[PDB]
Amino acid sequence: MQYTPDTAWKITGFSREISPAYRQKLLSLGMLPGSSFNVVRVAPLGDPIHIETRRVSLVLRKKDLALLEVEAVSSLEHHHHHH
């Protein structure tokens, strides 16, 4: 139950073992870590991990997810604009 259809994963950064292709993609986009993303769905049949982010959609293999540094979020904090 490591991967679920609804999970808020925090993005900390890519691992060293990470491939040059994926790593380069981070360099190409100025949207580097520092936020969280939700999983669109998880295929137990044996398909890669499909994830969606308000920024863009992307799919990575299970191994790729393990390599990427991620952390679960449960802080649950909100600020009031006024009053």
Explain what the structure shows.
There is one protein chain. The protein is an alpha+beta fold. The chain has one domain (1-83): Ferrous iron transport protein A (FeoA) (SH3 type barrels, Roll), CATH 2.30.30. The chain is 18% helix and 30% strand. It is built from 2 helices and 5 strands; from the N terminus they run βαβββαβ. The protein is globular and about 50 Å long. One of its GO terms (molecular function) is transition metal ion binding. Monomer.
Furnish the topology, listing elements before pairings:
Blueprint (H helix, E strand, L loop, with lengths): L7 E6 L6 H9 L7 E7 L6 E4 L4 E4 L1 H6 L1 E4 L11
Antiparallel strand pairs: 1-2, 1-5, 2-3, 3-4
State the main characteristics.
83 residues, alpha+beta, SH3 type barrels, five-stranded antiparallel sheet, 2 helices, 5 strands, 18% helix, 30% strand
CA(first)-CA(last) distance: 41 Å
**Which fold name is given in CATH as the topology?**
SH3 type barrels
Strand order of the largest sheet: 4-3-2-1-5
Radius of gyration: 14 Å
Number of contiguous helices: 2
Q: Determine and state the CATH class.
A: Mainly Beta
> Any idea what the CATH superfamily is called?
Ferrous iron transport protein A (FeoA)
Largest β-sheet summary: 5 strands, antiparallel
What does this entry show, briefly?
This protein is an alpha+beta fold and 83 residues long. The chain is 18% helix and 30% strand.
